[PDB]
Structure 1
Amino acid sequence: DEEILEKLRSIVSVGDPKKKYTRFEKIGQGASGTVYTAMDVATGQEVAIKQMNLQQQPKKELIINEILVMRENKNPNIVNYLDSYLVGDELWVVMEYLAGGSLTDVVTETCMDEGQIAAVCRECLQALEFLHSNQVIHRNIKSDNILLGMDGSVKLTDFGFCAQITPEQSKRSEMVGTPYWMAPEVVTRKAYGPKVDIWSLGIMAIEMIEGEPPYLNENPLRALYLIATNGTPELQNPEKLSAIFRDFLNRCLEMDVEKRGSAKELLQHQFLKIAKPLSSLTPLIAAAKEATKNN
């Protein structure tokens, strides 16, 4: 529709990004747009800006929904929205910039100890508690969507797949997310809720342990089948984990949605009590950057 486009345009101001921001440097590109780093002229704040051609963009309703969700869900454990501009047919969206890279770089190139894993899980559960208390389900938790500051701060990004629920409609039933990280009830199209994010967090903790989510060697379709049929995945070497870490994982990856922990109750779990300070993550960030120099 041209109606859905006009609705998208209406929630964005018309203006020039260069009035407030400079030193644009392209760090990425794709169909969904070009991504730059840039700087706030008045404050010196480094920012991340996405340039997007609106005409060609499919499923504009998801762009409307992401912008709306960010504007009303600002939090220290989220990669926050700063501003947006319309210029001609292109949309510019300004976000905080995190210079420490993604958690994916860390889990694929380093060995995290349990204190560092507990820290990351805590910060993520803080974001999830905030989101769920505002009836937002992320539905795409994975290390790729966890970004790190150079001080070890931990923030969640990418709200392109999130669902807003209501007491009227408090559950969803559609297969949305990234296969390896999807909870069984999502994969098999049952009525589901916020605890699907708790499952995906459990899979991300398996990333921090083993380097990959379960079945990454398989194609996405085979992985969906395996999740549906196996339920709670198995660790290669559970012997290597503490009793309290194993219990934390079990409570994230519980098949029974009523038995699975909420974000609020996992924030009280004993595993998080051994978390190291976030400064402990900066050597991992340094390692990850070194590892990925050649790409």
Structure 2
Amino acid sequence: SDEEILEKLRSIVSVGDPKKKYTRFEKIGQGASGTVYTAMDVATGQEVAIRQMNLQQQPKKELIINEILVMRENKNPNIVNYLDSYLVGDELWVVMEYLAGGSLTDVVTETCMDEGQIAAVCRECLQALEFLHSNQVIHRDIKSDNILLGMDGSVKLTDFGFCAQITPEQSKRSEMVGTPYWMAPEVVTRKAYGPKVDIWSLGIMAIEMIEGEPPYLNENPLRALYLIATNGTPELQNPEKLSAIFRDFLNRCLDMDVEKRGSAKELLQHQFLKIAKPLSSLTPLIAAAKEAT
């Protein structure tokens, strides 16, 4: 009940109004969970990212609560940090750190990453996934739009509006919640998928860093799902241009047989990640992508 739900949120958030705590608001995006702004913390002077949402006009209240609770209790260096939340009337505020570097999508569509830079991004994403999966959380919507970058080359994952919390008693889900082009086949072909669906999505992001877009991008979402489920493991345009160790990494992420697909813990040991350049190597790409954005 919107009532029992509102009390739940009331217990979760900090008391009072945020309006006096932050200044210089600047819209930077929007989603089904609200509008996101860049703002200045009056006290600390830290620039943050604030999402404002009107509860009255919000379908799944349960999901927003779950999103906040998951972020609060699963802090990690590779996950955009959740700072606080407030509730003023029907206006819910969620405050988190701001990554000024933009998204990975901007980088892959505007620049050309080399393998050493790709291995670094993949490593950081895998660190977030290994952490989440070992903490019983499947993100379920891994894609370049949800990977943000710091001006120093930091790589962090965000938007837990679709994550799932599992347990040994119930280690699998069946809800279709991800984004078509990054969805693993089993999410379609059958019911009951596990944490490895995030590994598949990571593999698609790797293709993105290589080719600039995920497979079937020019195709209709409804169609893409069919193709993914029927063709399975995507085909690379110019496989011969990639190193043997990167090609092997890709095959382990995009394997059809879930059991055969590498897990996060396993892939963190993969030798492709060892050719990673320092994250500072991403700063030139971020600058270029940002200017073009």
RMSD of aligned C-alpha atoms? 1.3
Q: Is the 8 A contact 2:53 2:93 kept in 1?
A: yes
Deviation at 1:35, TM superposition (A): 1.7
Deviates more, 1:282-291 or 1:246-255: 282-291
Deviates more, 1:2-11 or 1:154-163: 2-11
Q: Is the 8 A contact 2:56 2:90 kept in 1?
A: yes
Deviation at 1:6, TM superposition (A): 3.5
Q: Is the 8 A contact 1:8 1:60 kept in 2?
A: no
> CA offsets, 1:207-235, max 9 Å, x none?
00001100011000100000110111111
Partner of 2:53: 52
2:23 aligns to what SS in structure 1?
A: strand
**Structure 1 length as normaliser, TM-score?**
0.95
Deviation at 1:30, TM superposition (A): 5.5
Deviates more, 1:266-275 or 1:25-34: 25-34
1:169 aligns to what SS in structure 2?
A: coil
Deviates more, 1:86-95 or 1:41-50: 41-50
Q: Is the 8 A contact 2:14 2:84 kept in 1?
A: no
1:34 aligns to what SS in structure 2?
A: strand
Aligned-partner Cα distance in 1 for 2:177–2:230:
18
Distance change (3 Å), C-alpha of 1:226 and 1:30: closer
Q: Is the 8 A contact 2:33 2:64 kept in 1?
A: no
> CA offsets, 1:37-95, max 9 Å, x none?
11222322110011111111111111011001000011110011001011111001100
Q: Is the 8 A contact 2:36 2:52 kept in 1?
A: yes
**What is the number of equivalent residue pairs in this alignment?**
292
Gaps of at least 5 residues in structure 2 are none
Aligned-partner Cα distance in 2 for 1:33–1:190:
30
Distance change (3 Å), C-alpha of 1:277 and 1:43: same
Gaps of at least 5 residues in structure 1 are none
Q: Is the 8 A contact 2:26 2:38 kept in 1?
A: yes
Deviation at 1:168, TM superposition (A): 1.2
Deviates more, 1:11-20 or 1:43-52: 11-20
**Structure 2 length as normaliser, TM-score?**
0.96
Partner of 1:138: 139
Partner of 1:259: 260
Deviation at 1:188, TM superposition (A): 2.0
Aligned-partner Cα distance in 1 for 2:69–2:177:
19
Partner of 1:167: 168
Q: Is the 8 A contact 1:175 1:189 kept in 2?
A: no
Aligned-partner Cα distance in 2 for 1:30–1:172:
24
Aligned-partner Cα distance in 1 for 2:33–2:233:
34
Q: Percent identity?
A: 99
Q: Does 1:240 align with 2:219?
A: no
> CA offsets, 1:166-217, max 9 Å, x none?
1111101121200000111112233111111000000000000001100011
> CA offsets, 1:216-270, max 9 Å, x none?
1100010000011011111111111100000000000011111111111111101
